[PDB]
Structures are given as structure tokens and as C-alpha cells.
Write a protein that binds this ligand. Structure first.
Ligand SMILES: CC(C)(C)[C@@H]1CCN(c2ncnc3[nH]ccc23)[C@H](CO)C1
Length: 167
């Protein structure tokens, strides 16, 4: 039993809700919140910009030190950093950005990072400003993640389409 509330159950392990991931994280304080990161950990917009803003830019400061030490992530890769005031940990995961021409097959690799954590609050990878089809992202999530994932979908219209079209 966990403290996630109001989710629809899609499968044994995947749950979905129309919610602002920032507000969800602030309420639940999960062990792991997933960020829709880029390889440079430049949290300018989308989910990443919103999460970073909620940390008063502390996420960006920590991220800049991480990159200065380690260099960029791989597309499809991840790193674990602090969750600041939002969660214990933030799993920064790089889905392919279709608006940069990146290979959508890497979306499965990106979701594989979730399997290293028993429970996660997450957005749909490569959705929003990353340019991928969210219906496809949900399908890859369900077919790749085996741990317990609670998906927050900000847009109510998109949430309803994802549920109604889910196979
Ligand atoms: C569908 C659309 C492109 C409009 C969104 C954009 C951002 N994003 C978010 N998801 C959950 N919580 C969020 N909080 C702030 C942003 C955000 C989604 C990533 O799957 C896609």
C-alpha cells in the first residue's frame, strides 16, 4: 500500500492520472520522481522546467555540478540526483526528442531505467515538447516497465484520449 490517490489502473503495475506532476510530487513526496531530462540537464521548459522552478532552481544548480563532473547523459540514459523538496530522489531520464531528430526506438531504453526503482511517479517520456506521440509512449511504458509506475498527465484532454484508446 502506498499514498498515491485517484489513479486509474491500466495494468498490474501501471497507473495513470490527470495531474500536475509538480503538485503530485509536493503532495505525495514519493521516493522517486522522474524528470523528463535532456542530456545536458538544462531544465528550461516542459516537465523539467516546471520541476526545477518548484525547487527554486536548486535542481539546476545540482545538475550543473553533475554535468561539470560527469559530462552529458546518453539519449536513453539516466542519473539519480536529489529530489529536493519534491521527492527523496529525482531520476533524470532522457527520452529521445523527436524535434531534434533522435531515434524513437531509444524510448524503450529510456523506460528501462524505471526498472531500477520499485515505485516511481513519472511523466510520459518523450511526450509534450519532446515531440513523440503520447499514445505510443504509454504503450512502450506498459510493455517495458515492470516496477510500479504512477503516471501524471498534465493535459486533461490528452488524459481522456490515453485512457479511451488504451488497449
Ligand atoms: C501533452 C503536453 C505536451 C502538453 C505535456 C507537456 C508537459 N508534460 C507534463 N506532464 C506532467 N506534468 C507536467 N507538469 C508540467 C509539465 C508536465 C507532458 C510530458 O509527458 C506532456
Amino acid at each position: 500500500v502506498n499514498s498515491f490517490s485517484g489513479y486509474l489502473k491500466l495494468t498490474d503495475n501501471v497507473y495513470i492520472k490527470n495531474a500536475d506532476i509538480v503538485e503530485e510530487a509536493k503532495k505525495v513526496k514519493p521516493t522517486v520522481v522522474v524528470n523528463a531530462a535532456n542530456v545536458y540537464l538544462k531544465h528550461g521548459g516542459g516537465v523539467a522546467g516546471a520541476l526545477n522552478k518548484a525547487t527554486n532552481n536548486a535542481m539546476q544548480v545540482e545538475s550543473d555540478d553533475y554535468i561539470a563532473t560527469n559530462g552529458p547523459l546518453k539519449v536513453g540514459g539516466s542519473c539519480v540526483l536529489s529530489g529536493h523538496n519534491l521527492a527523496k530522489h529525482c531520476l533524470h531520464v532522457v527520452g529521445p526528442n523527436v524535434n531534434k531528430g533522435e531515434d524513437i526506438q531509444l524510448l524503450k531504453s529510456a523506460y528501462e531505467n524505471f526498472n531500477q526503482h520499485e515505485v516511481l511517479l513519472a511523466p510520459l517520456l518523450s511526450a509534450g515538447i519532446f515531440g513523440a506521440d503520447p499514445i505510443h509512449s504509454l504503450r512502450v511504458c506498459v510493455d517495458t516497465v515492470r516496477t510500479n509506475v504512477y503516471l501524471a498527465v498534465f493535459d486533461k484532454n490528452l488524459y481522456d484520449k490515453l485512457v479511451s484508446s488504451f488497449l
